[PDB]
Design a protein around this ligand. Sequence first.
Ligand code: XD8
Length: 485
Amino acid sequence: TSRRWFHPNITGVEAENLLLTRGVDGSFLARPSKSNPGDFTLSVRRNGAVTHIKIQNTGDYYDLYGGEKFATLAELVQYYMEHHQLVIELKYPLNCADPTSERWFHGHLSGKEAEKLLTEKGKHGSFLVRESQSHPGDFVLSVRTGSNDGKSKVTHVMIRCQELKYDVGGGERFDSLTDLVEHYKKNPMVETLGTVLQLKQPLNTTRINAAEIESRVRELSKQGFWEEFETLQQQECKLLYSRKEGQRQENKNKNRYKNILPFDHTRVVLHDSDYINANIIMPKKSYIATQGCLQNTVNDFWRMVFQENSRVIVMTTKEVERGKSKCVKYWPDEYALKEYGVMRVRNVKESAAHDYTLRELKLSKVGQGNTERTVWQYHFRTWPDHGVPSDPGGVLDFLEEVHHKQESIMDAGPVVVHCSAGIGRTGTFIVIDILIDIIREKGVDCDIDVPKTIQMVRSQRSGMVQTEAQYRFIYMAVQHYIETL
Ligand SMILES: Nc1nc(N2CCC3(CC2)Cc2ncccc2[C@H]3N)cnc1Sc1ccnc(N)c1Cl
């Protein structure tokens, strides 16, 4: 679908005027808050007037004031538009023409730099659009078709801006670069002598050699970080997979947050009553991304760990933060034995480090003493209440220990990771782990692609990695890991 209802570069005044002049009753857009940076604003028109509704994100979920909690703004907007009541109606998305957040748009990039990138990083059908230095307000579409043999080339197409409309010198005049690019992706320009200018994929400029991380971070820090993140966010509209199972009446009470649900195609199905709010994550270590246990899902959590042959649990929340319950205690006190339905757990021993507690747990099925296995619970305890850690050292040291534990156990199943909703902190830990894993195996001369890896994880559980602050912290963690090798 589209995410054109998000306006990245708009003020609250510009939004009102846009809704009052170019919209009607039931029209809406979403945008950054200017008065609460890191937060967002749903701007709706009702009775010839505009209401601004605050969306908070502190790292766990998108909290809509007077509404529900959501994994993504796209899942939020799909929920309300599919009247699934906010009464205030989201009827008519008001579309953004600003190309800032398209994968293929490179703003004030030179034709020199453009041609280097396309030559080095481009393949057949790689394209980009950039501002023209020559013709202020115009753009250049550059497309590669096919490094020594001249079997490939770069064609440059001038895009004219005339009275707010865009064209390639003839044919249709479009209201936005996006319209122009979508048209010629569907109906490719052909050259006099036969060459088809296939716009097959945006040029990849996010993949870097690992050694260049410090360099890429310095570039992103002068602001490139915000551009790259909001471009990733715009791609979330491709990940609106079904979560039907999590919406069944008998499964509603098993979700910590009603509208933060596992995708059907990657959910953990419990065999031998089949449902848990948990997804398999495959990047080679694999993972289970899940929520903090509720009182009524502790039994299901242990059925999942047993079934999946999980030998390591990563908990990235306290039980209680800012006086709110994030996760029920699902482990026995040290030396104690508990039964959780058909699953029996002994807490064999706890060891405390600064940033974490390790609990050595023995898990078996009641009735069958031969089913016993050790499950190691790494409980990270120093994650801040607001934002992300100032230093990644504690998280990297933690993950290094988790990695060694997992590697030490023959045929260990996926690593269980959870926070509250199991999308923000959980996503952040899992993406750091996957990226470091690559560098650990394939060495400092390997390619990493942070947004590609996040998009791949977000295809398996909604909204994995919640904030720009987490996105920055992932880059910082990968940089620190590279700097100490
Ligand atoms: N986060 C992403 N960033 C980019 N860059 C960086 C940001 C800009 C587009 C190019 C550069 C720019 N420069 C100036 C102004 C505005 C802008 C942005 N539009 C491209 N794609 C993604 S998402 C992505 C990547 C890799 N793989 C998959 N699967 C996915 Cl979804």
